[PDB]
């Protein structure tokens, strides 16, 4: 038996998205947000790897 040993390295896919709503329901598709400082943020991070 002849053993050819090979290797490599991979990158997992991890993301986040700004949920437009409370309860973290709908992502934001615009490229910029103009908001009020008194409003609240709702963001989360996905894992598609």
């Amino acid at each position: 038996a002849l053993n050819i040993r090979v290797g490599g390295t991979g990158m997992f896919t991890v993301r986040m998205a700004l949920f437009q709503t409370p309860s973290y329901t709908q992502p934001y598709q615009g490229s910029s947000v103009t908001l009020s400082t008194e409003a609240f943020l709702y963001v989360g991070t996905m894992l598609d790897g």
Partner: protein, 75 residues
Amino acid sequence: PCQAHRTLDEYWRSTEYGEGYACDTDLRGWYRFVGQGGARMAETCVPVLRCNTAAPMWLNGTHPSSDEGIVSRKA
């Protein structure tokens, strides 16, 4: 009509809700308003920066009574 609809149970759509930025680019069709927010939407111009949105809308005019049919309005 009254049989074909999608209910919407979002307690944050109330006139009481403080402020947010959600924008309904994707709401297509007939919908049924159900939940703590109530059964009917706004009738007068609610003050600005309410309902989890910077610029809310509202139906001007009144709700049609029972047995009135399809009514055209401009929110």
